């Protein structure tokens, strides 16, 4: 049920993205912390237990609403992880993903009727995920996972270093 030994796969994911430790600006309005996240990924399966995968993630744009100051933060990146899986049944796997993300985060803020700025930064963060994967056909599988990414930013540059959690459904095709 894990992809056959020495096989390639490609897939995509959609998810509920939520940022945490979101300190940035002292805005007096709401912040919309739940956002659509998305990504593409591809990988290679070594054996039923071990695979490696790379992907791009869009982590979503968080608005900071307010009438004193308002702004936004967004992040995205490229990740590389090892996937370690246990065949809990002969058709369902449970897995963890371990590795890192090269990320770009962008911020903006403005004062209503006044000044504004845009900034961005780049850096590297650890990625951990856990999930289950079900093989629908020998070619198609679906994933449900939670992906945690730490310190997406720098408080000395863009002014925030939030964490991201993302629950996602993914689908992949296997080139067996």
């Amino acid at each position, epitope marked *: 049920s894990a992809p056959k030994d020495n096989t390639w796969y490609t897939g995509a994911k959609l998810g509920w993205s939520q940022y945490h430790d979101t300190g*940035f*600006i*002292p805005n007096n309005g709401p912040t919309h912390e739940n956002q659509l996240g998305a990504g593409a990924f591809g990988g290679y399966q070594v054996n039923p237990y071990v695979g490696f995968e790379m992907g791009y993630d869009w982590l979503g744009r968080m608005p900071y609403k307010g009438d*004193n100051i308002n702004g936004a933060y967004k992040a995205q990146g490229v990740q590389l992880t090892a996937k370690l899986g246990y065949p809990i049944t002969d058709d369902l796997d449970i897995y963890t993903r371990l590795g890192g993300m090269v990320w770009r985060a962008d911020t903006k803020a403005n004062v209503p009727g006044g000044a504004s700025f845009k900034d961005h930064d780049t850096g590297v963060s650890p990625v951990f995920a856990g999930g289950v994967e079900y093989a629908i056909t020998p070619e198609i599988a679906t994933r449900l996972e939670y992906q945690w990414t730490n310190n997406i930013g720098d408080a*000395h*540059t863009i002014g925030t270093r939030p964490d991201n959690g993302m629950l996602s459904l993914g689908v992949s095709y296997r080139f067996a």
Partner: nanobody
Amino acid sequence: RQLVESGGGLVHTGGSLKLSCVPNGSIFNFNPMGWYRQVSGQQRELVATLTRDGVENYASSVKGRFTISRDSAKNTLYLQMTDVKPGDAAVYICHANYRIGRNDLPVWGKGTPVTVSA
């Protein structure tokens, strides 16, 4: 409508005044806060500033005559002017800087007029 100033008008030479400015949201959202002064079409002169940690700085033209302060329970920044010279008449303007990592984001008020008699 972010920084709102009050309390200018006429003062006599050698007299005294208190200006006040209340910000949208909280003092301590900013570092520093300050006062500037402008005569019609001349540059904004920095008058005084006050850091989040409460350190105070002054222009040499007002040092020892004016004093900068706040009251957190009032949410108010004050300029106390004493020993007013005729060279201190201006529109006095409240300033407030948001410090967002490496980025500085300034806020300015319309200002309040101060006029001086001999």
